[PDB]
């Protein structure tokens, strides 16, 4: 998660088990990508403002190995398409995209990465 308190520099902190547990229990048996699943995960992304790495960890914790593999493939395609368009806050001469999306200071890029990560669930059967 990225902590961005008012008027102080942002910083990354690791996921805490109690936070992950609450997300998993709220999702319960809702199919990945379903309206109930997305309603919960959208709120989790807002509350914890996760980096790209944090989102990989959340996907791995919440979903089966199969769903995670499908999501990985879909998001990789969406990222390639987004790079062709240009992405808010992404400088192609700086770090790898996913490194930049782990930089707490690059909030605009992280938020756009979050949107792509959420959108990748739409490719799954279920919804």
Residue numbers in the entry: 1 to 127
Q: What did the original publication write about this model?
A:
During screening, a third crystal form of HTLV-1 CANTD was observed diffracting to 1.47 Å resolution in space group P212121 with two molecules in the asymmetric unit. In this case, the crystallant included 0.2 M ammonium sulfate. In one of the HTLV-1 CANTD molecules, a sulfate ion is unambiguously resolved bound to an electropositive pocket on the NTD surface formed by α-helices 3, 4, 5 and 7. The sulfate ion is coordinated by residues H71, H72, R98, and W117. The sidechains of Q56, H72 and R98 appear to act as gatekeepers that flip up and down to allow the sulfate entry into the pocket. Mutants that would remove a direct interaction with the sulfate or phosphate groups (H71A, H72A, R98A and W117A) all effectively abolished infectivity with a concomitant loss of particle production. As the equivalent site has been exploited for the development of arguably the most potent and longest-acting anti-HIV drug, our structural and phenotype data suggest that similar attention should be paid to this site in HTLV-1 with a view to the development of capsid-targeting pre-exposure prophylactics.
